[PDB]
Amino acid sequence: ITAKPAKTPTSPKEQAIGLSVTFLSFLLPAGWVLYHLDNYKKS
Amino acid sequence: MFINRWLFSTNHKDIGTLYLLFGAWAGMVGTALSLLIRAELGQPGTLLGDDQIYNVVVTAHAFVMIFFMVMPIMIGGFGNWLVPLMIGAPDMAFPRMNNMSFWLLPPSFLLLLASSMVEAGAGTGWTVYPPLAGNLAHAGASVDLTIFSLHLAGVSSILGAINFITTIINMKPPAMSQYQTPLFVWSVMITAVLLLLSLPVLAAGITMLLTDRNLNTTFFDPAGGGDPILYQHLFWFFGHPEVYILILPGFGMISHIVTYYSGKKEPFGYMGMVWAMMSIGFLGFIVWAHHMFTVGMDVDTRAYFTSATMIIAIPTGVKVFSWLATLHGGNIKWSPAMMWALGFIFLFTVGGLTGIVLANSSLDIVLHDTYYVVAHFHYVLSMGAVFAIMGGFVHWFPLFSGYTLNDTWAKIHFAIMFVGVNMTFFPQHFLGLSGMPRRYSDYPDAYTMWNTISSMGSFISLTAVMLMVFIIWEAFASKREVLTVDLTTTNLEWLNGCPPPYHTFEEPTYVNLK
Amino acid sequence: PSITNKRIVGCICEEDNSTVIWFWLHKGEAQRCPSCGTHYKLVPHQLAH
Amino acid sequence: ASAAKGDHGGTGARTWRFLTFGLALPSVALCTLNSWLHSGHRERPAFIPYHHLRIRTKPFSWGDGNHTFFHNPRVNPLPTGYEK
Amino acid sequence: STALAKPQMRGLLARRLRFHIVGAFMVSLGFATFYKFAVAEKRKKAYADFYRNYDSMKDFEEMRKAGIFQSAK
Amino acid sequence: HETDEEFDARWVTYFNKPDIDAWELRKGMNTLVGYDLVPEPKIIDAALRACRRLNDFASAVRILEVVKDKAGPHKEIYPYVIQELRPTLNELGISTPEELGLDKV
Amino acid sequence: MAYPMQLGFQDATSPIMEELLHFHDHTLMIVFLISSLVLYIISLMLTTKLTHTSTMDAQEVETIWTILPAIILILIALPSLRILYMMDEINNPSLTVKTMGHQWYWSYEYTDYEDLSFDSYMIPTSELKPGELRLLEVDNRVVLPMEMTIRMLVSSEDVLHSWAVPSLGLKTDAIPGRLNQTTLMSSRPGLYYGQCSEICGSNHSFMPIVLELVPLKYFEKWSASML
Amino acid sequence: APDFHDKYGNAVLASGATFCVAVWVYMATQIGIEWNPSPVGRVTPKEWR
Amino acid sequence: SVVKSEDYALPSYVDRRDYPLPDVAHVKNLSASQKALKEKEKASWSSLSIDEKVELYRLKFKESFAEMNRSTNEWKTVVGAAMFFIGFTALLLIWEKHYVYGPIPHTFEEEWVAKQTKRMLDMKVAPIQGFSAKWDYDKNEWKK
Amino acid sequence: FENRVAEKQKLFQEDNGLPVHLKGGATDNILYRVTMTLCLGGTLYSLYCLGWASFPHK
Amino acid sequence: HYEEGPGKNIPFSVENKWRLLAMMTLFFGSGFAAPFFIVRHQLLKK
Numbered sequence A: 001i002t003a004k005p006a007k008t009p010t011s012p013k014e015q016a017i018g019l020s021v022t023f024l025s026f027l028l029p030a031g032w033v034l035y036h037l038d039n040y041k042k043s
Numbered sequence B: 001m002f003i004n005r006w007l008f009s010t011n012h013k014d015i016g017t018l019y020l021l022f023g024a025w026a027g028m029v030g031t032a033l034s035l036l037i038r039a040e041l042g043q044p045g046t047l048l049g050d051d052q053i054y055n056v057v058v059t060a061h062a063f064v065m066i067f068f069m070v071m072p073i074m075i076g077g078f079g080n081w082l083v084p085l086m087i088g089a090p091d092m093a094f095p096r097m098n099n100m101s102f103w104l105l106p107p108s109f110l111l112l113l114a115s116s117m118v119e120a121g122a123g124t125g126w127t128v129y130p131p132l133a134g135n136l137a138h139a140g141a142s143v144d145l146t147i148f149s150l151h152l153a154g155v156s157s158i159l160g161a162i163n164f165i166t167t168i169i170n171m172k173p174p175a176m177s178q179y180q181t182p183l184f185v186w187s188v189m190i191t192a193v194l195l196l197l198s199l200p201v202l203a204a205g206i207t208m209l210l211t212d213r214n215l216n217t218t219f220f221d222p223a224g225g226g227d228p229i230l231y232q233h234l235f236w237f238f239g240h241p242e243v244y245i246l247i248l249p250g251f252g253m254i255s256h257i258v259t260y261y262s263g264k265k266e267p268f269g270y271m272g273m274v275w276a277m278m279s280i281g282f283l284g285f286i287v288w289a290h291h292m293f294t295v296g297m298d299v300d301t302r303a304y305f306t307s308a309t310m311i312i313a314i315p316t317g318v319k320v321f322s323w324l325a326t327l328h329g330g331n332i333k334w335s336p337a338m339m340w341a342l343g344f345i346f347l348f349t350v351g352g353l354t355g356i357v358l359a360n361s362s363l364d365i366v367l368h369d370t371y372y373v374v375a376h377f378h379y380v381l382s383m384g385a386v387f388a389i390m391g392g393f394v395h396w397f398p399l400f401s402g403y404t405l406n407d408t409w410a411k412i413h414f415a416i417m418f419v420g421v422n423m424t425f426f427p428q429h430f431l432g433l434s435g436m437p438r439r440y441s442d443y444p445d446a447y448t449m450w451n452t453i454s455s456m457g458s459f460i461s462l463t464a465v466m467l468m469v470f471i472i473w474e475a476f477a478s479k480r481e482v483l484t485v486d487l488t489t490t491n492l493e494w495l496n497g498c499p500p501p502y503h504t505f506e507e508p509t510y511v512n513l514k
Numbered sequence C: 001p002s003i004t005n006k007r008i009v010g011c012i013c014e015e016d017n018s019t020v021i022w023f024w025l026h027k028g029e030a031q032r033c034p035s036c037g038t039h040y041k042l043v044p045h046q047l048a049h
Numbered sequence D: 001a002s003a004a005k006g007d008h009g010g011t012g013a014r015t016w017r018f019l020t021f022g023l024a025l026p027s028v029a030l031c032t033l034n035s036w037l038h039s040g041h042r043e044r045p046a047f048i049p050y051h052h053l054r055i056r057t058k059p060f061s062w063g064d065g066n067h068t069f070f071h072n073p074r075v076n077p078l079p080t081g082y083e084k
Numbered sequence E: 001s002t003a004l005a006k007p008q009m010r011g012l013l014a015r016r017l018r019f020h021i022v023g024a025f026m027v028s029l030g031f032a033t034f035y036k037f038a039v040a041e042k043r044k045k046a047y048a049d050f051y052r053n054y055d056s057m058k059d060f061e062e063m064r065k066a067g068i069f070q071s072a073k
Numbered sequence F: 001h002e003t004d005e006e007f008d009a010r011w012v013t014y015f016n017k018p019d020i021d022a023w024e025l026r027k028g029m030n031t032l033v034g035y036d037l038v039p040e041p042k043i044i045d046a047a048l049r050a051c052r053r054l055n056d057f058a059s060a061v062r063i064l065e066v067v068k069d070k071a072g073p074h075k076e077i078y079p080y081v082i083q084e085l086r087p088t089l090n091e092l093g094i095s096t097p098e099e100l101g102l103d104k105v
Numbered sequence G: 001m002a003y004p005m006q007l008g009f010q011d012a013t014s015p016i017m018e019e020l021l022h023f024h025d026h027t028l029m030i031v032f033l034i035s036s037l038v039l040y041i042i043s044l045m046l047t048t049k050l051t052h053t054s055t056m057d058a059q060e061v062e063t064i065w066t067i068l069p070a071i072i073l074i075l076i077a078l079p080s081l082r083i084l085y086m087m088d089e090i091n092n093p094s095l096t097v098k099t100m101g102h103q104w105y106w107s108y109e110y111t112d113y114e115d116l117s118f119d120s121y122m123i124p125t126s127e128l129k130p131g132e133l134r135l136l137e138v139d140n141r142v143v144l145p146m147e148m149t150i151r152m153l154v155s156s157e158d159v160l161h162s163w164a165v166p167s168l169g170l171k172t173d174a175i176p177g178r179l180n181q182t183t184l185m186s187s188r189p190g191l192y193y194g195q196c197s198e199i200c201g202s203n204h205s206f207m208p209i210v211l212e213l214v215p216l217k218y219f220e221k222w223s224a225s226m227l
Numbered sequence H: 001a002p003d004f005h006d007k008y009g010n011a012v013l014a015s016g017a018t019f020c021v022a023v024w025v026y027m028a029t030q031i032g033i034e035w036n037p038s039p040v041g042r043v044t045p046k047e048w049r
Numbered sequence I: 001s002v003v004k005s006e007d008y009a010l011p012s013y014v015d016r017r018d019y020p021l022p023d024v025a026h027v028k029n030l031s032a033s034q035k036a037l038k039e040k041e042k043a044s045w046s047s048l049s050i051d052e053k054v055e056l057y058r059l060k061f062k063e064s065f066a067e068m069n070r071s072t073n074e075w076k077t078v079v080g081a082a083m084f085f086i087g088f089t090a091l092l093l094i095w096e097k098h099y100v101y102g103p104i105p106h107t108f109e110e111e112w113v114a115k116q117t118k119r120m121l122d123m124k125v126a127p128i129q130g131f132s133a134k135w136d137y138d139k140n141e142w143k144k
Numbered sequence J: 001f002e003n004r005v006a007e008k009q010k011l012f013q014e015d016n017g018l019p020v021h022l023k024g025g026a027t028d029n030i031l032y033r034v035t036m037t038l039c040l041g042g043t044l045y046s047l048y049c050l051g052w053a054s055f056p057h058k
Numbered sequence K: 001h002y003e004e005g006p007g008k009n010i011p012f013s014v015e016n017k018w019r020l021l022a023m024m025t026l027f028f029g030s031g032f033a034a035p036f037f038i039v040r041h042q043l044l045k046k
């Protein structure tokens, strides 16, 4: 396929931010629940 | 304008988009449920609780992946986007009923989530067998919310099936015969026939379970003269066609992808591919009791279901060999979608072959209700249906969106997922042969090593899923607009540009008869 | 016939081919089907036809 | 209804030939195989001169009068039992 | 200089395919032979050798003396 | 179907048509390269001379490139074909991709 | 029982289970061959710059790859069904034992002669004796006579369960209102373990099966002592 | 002009591999995961009764 | 040179080694000197210079076969990044082991395993091939 | 009765931009608001009921 | 009519990539988090 160059280029720094935010949005809430499992069961 | 467009849609592309977003969100839910299963099993002992909370998670994992991820994505998403464009039709036959098939799914999902929040959840397995799923062993609302969730998903797909069959039979160009329509269109028509015939029977069975739970019937209760095994017959009369429903649109997309990235104008053996899908659809209705080889059936019945089940390998093998023959002599473009399809061909074959092992009812005595079954069906579902979905998604994302993905990231994503799924499921064969049961929250110590590896595999697949979300973000963030697409002369769905206008084929194609 | 200045043509090159060849036919000189060369010419009009 | 498949996009000779070679003759081939396996002569059962069987109210109009038309000595006893 | 000879120019893909399908078939036979020896026959022979002079009463007495049974001390 | 000689002859005849047009030249070469063969020099010869009657130097060079490409890993084929075409290349003034530097990546 | 890092089936304890091992070896060889052949052909299709993109005739080649798989299926089906029917063959047991599934334990009834019955529960991990196996030991084992044909009858007094012993090749669902039959014959004394094999609620993972195979005279005295 | 892969490929490959090996080896050996390998050739059986 | 979105219904240029003669020229608009060159192309090509022949080629086509077919270093990036993210996954597993999983059961203690092993040998677990077959009951050691 | 289909054909073909579900006039708007209000209000009530049923009540 | 073209045939805005990141983060993150919080909920009951 061919395509135009990006209209709004996403630099490596911007990609590192997007990827870090994406990963943290999955990992932090689950991590919080799993970290506290004992407090839930011991309750 | 926003509500008119997105809540009152009568447009096959936008509804297709709605289904793709719904199934992507469901895929996250089902992935999280899968990581909770593998966390529980990732070391010996008990992590969460006993088998009830564990098997609420298992039960939901399966219903989410099947009814809210695979089927909405393949049929509601790719079906709605691609089928009208591939036959030059201006929309679906029933464009407003189409929208109700979509909008029934968020309430169906809400009912399943509600089932897991009330009482102690439905910890039944996705098969919902009584008496465990009945009103004494699963008292309270959870199982009834599950039944109703299935009712709504069933109605959604039955009406969608009617829509797809009608559209595909009635709305091709007048010169185009059924044998001039692309294989993905065939694969949707055949899946829709299977949905039309099988889901009413599931609806009958789960309605009988509902009345046994609430109206004092006794269809499945020996005290009234009922039989738990009748429920299993009704469920699996649906449940085996259902797995061909889950894979056939995948087979259709695989045919298009392999053809396209081999630089071919057509798949090898088109009529054999049609024959194979029709044969699979038909044979898929006469095999259901291979899910019941340990329930006490007469030997001649077991002999029949053993033999009929294995027949399906013949048309399926024609498809595999025909994909290989499509690659043969190709100018191979090693795009990410091609990698997904090549991984499909091989891993689907492995899972089909272990299904043929299981078809042998004598061996199935020992393998039934063990992880060998789990290994068979995740090879065809996580490395088959899902690989076809990811292949189709990366291939047609520029058509749907007008923007390109970063191919290097998409290849990284494939590589991670390929390692993760094989690390998750390959060791499960050993656990099954050596006798680890299904639906267990913990296992004898001997089974630790392979369970540990399997759970580590599941975290690799989590990393791939997170990366997938980032990749979609990066594409919409960077806005590389598509210019030219190769091979439009044999891929009509691209010929209206990327994305195609809201209305396409307002003036239909011209095709003569000669 | 067309109510605009281009329309998609599908060309079934030989009887019972399952492969249809699709291309845009534009107003002007006749064009040939990429696969088999059959000629097509657009005859645009208003829908009073 | 109950089966599967799914054409009906326009009936014609090509579709019925497709059904002939792709479904009907394969069925016959499969049943021919199945029959070729479960063949082989079963053990014949002890003769018991039941009075509701081997009926003879009038001699048959061929042979010695006491043999049925497609008499098979191996499996069809006479009123007096199997032949030698 | 010498001219270059004319090489084969037609059917090169088909020739490659034929040659390797045949090599694949030969390897498939090579593997089936190795598997029957190293796996299938090995198993038959392990079971036949184990049971050839097996003394189930002796086996039971060893287990009994080791203390493994509820029903036999 | 037809023998190798009947195939080559059909293709030689096709490109030798005096008033062959540009559409037919492209349709011809793009069809030819789908077969499992490298085209015989006599076919390529006819196609180059078609390029000449069509005043299209560039397509003549491209045709030489696709001969090399169709040979795949059989590195002996393309220099043989060029060798056999040298009289035509010289008569028509066609430079090879190599002589033009177009074989550099 | 299974042992650490185990790859295949538990060692056969009955002649039927030995039959299954040989049939599985046969079938697995085919699975390996076909899956290898496909992987290899994939790689071969993908490793050449030579091309052939014109239309390819399919008729001749589809004979091959319908007829060869049909033959392979028949080579699987024949020994598969032989074992199936041999498992069904009449054998004349010399003892019948019933087991009833329950949430979450098994009871056993040996009522050919006296009214002998008892419950059989998992040993809690906190109560294992040194050397005993987590999640597999029971308090009351199913003692049985070795080298004899035993009829096992399986049912349930509540939800579905399933009574399994992998090293004897046994798995029979436990269905309330239904009396399912299987046949058991151990070639050896010893201890043979299985686990409930139909999801049955909160402690499905924790209701195992232990058979204890001993000589007939020991079984008789044990039976007397269990009245 | 050299692209991303020309400029950085060697380093991405070397660093990725070194990191992956190191972190999996540490996970597998240093944090108390119980792999439960076979006792065969490893464990000296000890009296239990 | 400049391909536009609103051109998707028009014949387009592609570089594909299996479609060597695309439907349009790479460059359709010609300068004065490029016009003169196309006129000269109507005369004997032997009178064209090498630079003129190259320019004619680059008007007709964008990349040569050698250019369009070139190999790249992309695999290094793909394989290295995949290994990076697989390594990252191991960080999640270290976290999980540290913060989520508690002690495993006491049956994996070394002494328990040693006693459990002897008892499995005493009951002759898998004595034909799998487990006890690998123990030498006469020499009281693992078979070598 | 008399055949008044022609009159209804005129009404529903009037070039007023209205979607068919409102093209009958003001009564369509009322029945639409009643339906949507019951659906949206009912759906909120059902979420409330889920919330209630999600916890025990002694 | 409706807007057509890239970024316009979808029910979510792609006009600002950081607002988009936040929206996608809430969207996929809410789906992935939901089972963990349902598990917590069931544990906090009994």
Ligand SMILES: CCCCCCCCCCCCCCCCCC(=O)OCC(COC(=O)CCCCCCCCCCCCCCCCC)OC(=O)CCCCCCCCCCCCCCCCC
Pocket (backbone or CB within 6 Å): B350, B354, B422, B423, B426, B427, B429, B430, B433, G007, G008, G009, G028, G031, G032, G035, G036, G039
């Ligand atoms: C197939 C999906 C892709 C493969 C994914 C993982 C690949 C790596 C492994 C895998 C590498 C390929 C070899 C597969 C078998 C390896 C184990 C074995 O000895 O299996 C034995 C049997 C029964 O065993 C017995 O009664 C006898 C035991 C003999 C003990 C001797 C020691 C053997 C070595 C120890 C094994 C190490 C454990 C491996 C641990 C592996 C953990 C991931 O178990 C079974 O039935 C397992 C049933 C699996 C059925 C699916 C077949 C798909 C094959 C695809 C192959 C094409 C080329 C792959 C080419 C592969 C590249 C694509």
Ligand SMILES: CCCCCCCCCCCCCCCCCC(=O)OCC(COC(=O)CCCCCCCCCCCCCCCCC)OC(=O)CCCCCCCCCCCCCCCCC
Pocket (backbone or CB within 6 Å): B332, B333, B334, B339, B342, B343, B344, B346, B411, B414, B415, B416, B418, B419, E016, G039, G042, G043, G046, G047, G048, G049, I069, I070, I071, I072, I073, I074, I075, I076, I078, I079, I082, I083, I086
């Ligand atoms: C290839 C076999 C594939 C088998 C696949 C089976 C199914 C599995 C899924 C099918 C999966 C298929 C993946 C195949 C990769 C092909 C690479 C390639 O040529 O890509 C193209 C190149 C650029 O190439 C080109 O610009 C031109 C076109 C491409 C070359 C075509 C010509 C080939 C012919 C020449 C060969 C001569 C030999 C003759 C021989 C003939 C004898 C006569 O791109 C590059 O530089 C980078 C590409 C990177 C691919 C890495 C993904 C690996 C995923 C698997 C898990 C890894 C885990 C790692 C992390 C691990 C962590 C633990």
Ligand code: HEA
Pocket (backbone or CB within 6 Å): B243, B244, B246, B247, B290, B291, B309, B310, B312, B313, B314, B316, B317, B318, B320, B348, B349, B350, B351, B352, B353, B354, B355, B356, B358, B359, B360, B364, B367, B368, B369, B373, B376, B377, B380, B381, B384, B385, G034, G038, G068, G069, G070, G072, G073
């Ligand atoms: C995509 C989903 C999918 C697909 C396509 C299949 C396909 C098949 N499955 Fe299924 N299966 C499931 C999803 C799927 N399955 C699920 C979810 C369950 C469990 C349900 C539950 O209990 O929860 C299950 C359970 C299941 C069982 C029950 C096992 C048990 O519970 O004890 C069995 C038994 O026969 C079975 C057999 C088969 C067979 C023979 C096929 C065949 O269609 C496969 C045919 C394919 C090939 C054979 C490969 C390609 C062929 C060649 C390369 C040709 C040459 C091959 C030969 C000559 C053999 N499957």
Ligand code: HEA
Pocket (backbone or CB within 6 Å): B020, B023, B024, B026, B027, B028, B030, B031, B034, B035, B037, B038, B058, B059, B061, B062, B063, B065, B066, B069, B070, B073, B124, B125, B126, B127, B374, B378, B381, B382, B385, B386, B389, B390, B393, B421, B424, B437, B438, B439, B440, B441, B454, B458, B461, B462, B465
């Ligand atoms: C489609 C069906 C499907 C899929 C994809 C999966 C995926 C996975 N399953 Fe699946 N599983 C089932 C269907 C599926 N499962 C079924 C039916 C059961 C039986 C239930 C029962 O016993 O009742 C089951 C049971 C089951 C068990 C056995 C539980 C038990 O017996 O106790 C396990 C254990 O490891 C398991 C693990 C996993 C894992 C780690 C994945 C991972 O591979 C998942 C990784 C993530 C993905 C594959 C991404 C998901 C997709 C998206 C995010 C979509 C992207 C969207 C777009 C591109 C538009 N599953």
Ligand SMILES: CCCCC/C=C\C/C=C\C/C=C\C/C=C\CCCC(=O)O[C@H](COC(=O)CCCCCCCCCCCCCCCCC)COP(=O)(O)OCCN
Pocket (backbone or CB within 6 Å): D068, D069, D070, D071, D072, D076
């Ligand atoms: C595909 C294979 C079969 C093909 C058909 C074969 C012949 C059938 C012909 C017509 C059937 C009509 C008469 C039915 C009479 C019985 C024949 C039944 C078919 C048959 O052939 O039956 C045979 C007996 O034939 C016998 O008596 C002797 C039969 C010969 C004498 C028949 C005389 C009677 C004719 C009466 C005709 C009445 C017609 C009325 C029409 C009126 C219309 C208004 C059975 O063989 P068997 O050895 O007993 O058992 C086999 C043991 N190994």
Ligand SMILES: CCCCC/C=C/C/C=C/CCCCCCCC(=O)O[C@H](COC(=O)CCCCCCCCCCCCCCC)COP(=O)(O)OCC[N+](C)(C)C
Pocket (backbone or CB within 6 Å): B320, B321, B324, B325, B328, E010, E011, E013, E014, E017, E021, F001, F002, F003, F004, F007, F008, F035, F036, F037, G037, G038, G041, G052, G055, G056, G057, G058, G061, G064, G065
């Ligand atoms: C796990 C699955 C495997 C199970 C076992 C399966 C094994 C399959 C093995 C099959 C081998 C079949 C090989 C056929 C290759 C030979 C044909 C070919 O490749 O050649 C083509 C024949 O095409 C024609 O007409 C006839 C039609 C086209 C022929 C080419 C297409 C057939 C390709 C089959 C590819 C199979 C790929 C692997 C699949 C397993 C072209 O030939 P022609 O002379 O006409 O043109 C040549 C021009 N001349 C005349 C001037 C030279």
Ligand SMILES: CCCCCC/C=C/CCCCCCCCCC(=O)O[C@H](COC(=O)CCCCCCCCCCCCCCC)COP(=O)(O)OC[C@@H](O)CO
Pocket (backbone or CB within 6 Å): B298, D001, D002, D003
């Ligand atoms: C188009 C069709 C072509 C023909 C294909 C062949 C179909 C055959 C259907 C035959 C059904 C009737 C058979 C009755 C014979 C008695 C069987 C019986 O009575 O079996 C009972 C269940 O019966 C039962 O038919 C339950 C009966 C209903 C079963 C339905 C199964 C197939 C459903 C397909 C539906 C397709 C849709 C049709 C509508 C267009 C089970 O109990 P037993 O097995 O006794 O076990 C007791 C012993 O083990 C011990 O003492």
Ligand SMILES: CCCCCC/C=C\CCCCCCCCCC(=O)O[C@H](COC(=O)CCCCCCCCCCCCCCC)COP(=O)(O)OC[C@@H](O)CO
Pocket (backbone or CB within 6 Å): B093, B094, B095, B096, B097, B098, B148, B151, B152, B155, B158, B162, B200, B203
């Ligand atoms: C446990 C309790 C669960 C209850 C779940 C109930 C769920 C659903 C709520 C249903 C609300 C129904 C509202 C009316 C829907 C009418 C659909 C209709 O009539 O659809 C028609 C097409 O379907 C056709 O014909 C043929 C199809 C007509 C179908 C009519 C609707 C059936 C709804 C129930 C379906 C399942 C029935 C059981 C199957 C086992 C028209 O298609 P449109 O795209 O609209 O227009 C096309 C325009 O060209 C017409 O001018």
Ligand SMILES: CCCCCCCCCCO[C@@H]1O[C@H](CO)[C@@H](O[C@H]2O[C@H](CO)[C@@H](O)[C@H](O)[C@H]2O)[C@H](O)[C@H]1O
Pocket (backbone or CB within 6 Å): A027, A028, A029, A030, A031, A032, A034, A035, B035, B036, B039, I092, I095, I096, I099
């Ligand atoms: C199966 C999918 C899950 C994959 C694994 C997730 C990987 C890691 C995610 C990190 O999650 C965070 O981890 C912290 C610990 O590292 C937790 O802080 C907790 O621990 C801290 C340190 O003890 C305290 O400061 C905090 O207050 C306390 O909430 C925090 O809540 C949780 O969000």
Ligand SMILES: CCCCCCCCCCO[C@@H]1O[C@H](CO)[C@@H](O[C@H]2O[C@H](CO)[C@@H](O)[C@H](O)[C@H]2O)[C@H](O)[C@H]1O
Pocket (backbone or CB within 6 Å): J037, J038, J040, J041, J042, J045
């Ligand atoms: C436009 C959107 C419409 C949204 C309307 C929301 C209506 C909310 C009304 C609240 O109704 C509650 O529900 C029950 C009935 O309405 C009552 O329970 C009672 O109701 C039953 C009356 O039939 C009895 O059987 C039971 O004893 C008892 O739980 C309860 O008191 C009442 O507060």
Ligand SMILES: C[C@H](CCC(=O)O)[C@H]1CC[C@H]2[C@@H]3[C@H](O)C[C@@H]4C[C@H](O)CC[C@]4(C)[C@H]3C[C@H](O)[C@]12C
Pocket (backbone or CB within 6 Å): B271, B272, B275, B318, D014, D017, D018, D021, D022, D026, G059, G062, G063, G064, G066
């Ligand atoms: C007759 C029909 C359609 C032919 C056409 O009109 O183009 C074709 C298409 C696929 C063919 C079938 C498939 O190729 C699979 C089988 C191939 C075997 O060689 C013959 C039977 C076999 C079952 C074929 C019979 C018949 O030739 C079929 C069914």
Ligand SMILES: C[C@H](CCC(=O)O)[C@H]1CC[C@H]2[C@@H]3[C@H](O)C[C@@H]4C[C@H](O)CC[C@]4(C)[C@H]3C[C@H](O)[C@]12C
Pocket (backbone or CB within 6 Å): J001, J002
């Ligand atoms: C008034 C109407 C004439 C039709 C027309 O020209 O409007 C007549 C003709 C047919 C009549 C109907 C039919 O005769 C059938 C019914 C017969 C009953 O005795 C009266 C009601 C009944 C339902 C009739 C009602 C009404 O008088 C109808 C509807």
Ligand code: CUA
Pocket (backbone or CB within 6 Å): G101, G102, G104, G160, G161, G162, G196, G197, G198, G199, G200, G201, G203, G204, G205, G207
């Ligand atoms: Cu009892 Cu599971």
Ligand SMILES: [Cu+2]
Pocket (backbone or CB within 6 Å): B239, B240, B243, B287, B288, B290, B291
């Ligand atoms: Cu099935």
Ligand SMILES: [Mg+2]
Pocket (backbone or CB within 6 Å): B294, B368, B369, G162, G197, G198
């Ligand atoms: Mg079961």
Ligand code: NA
Pocket (backbone or CB within 6 Å): B040, B041, B042, B043, B044, B045, B046, B047, B441, B442, B443
């Ligand atoms: Na656990």
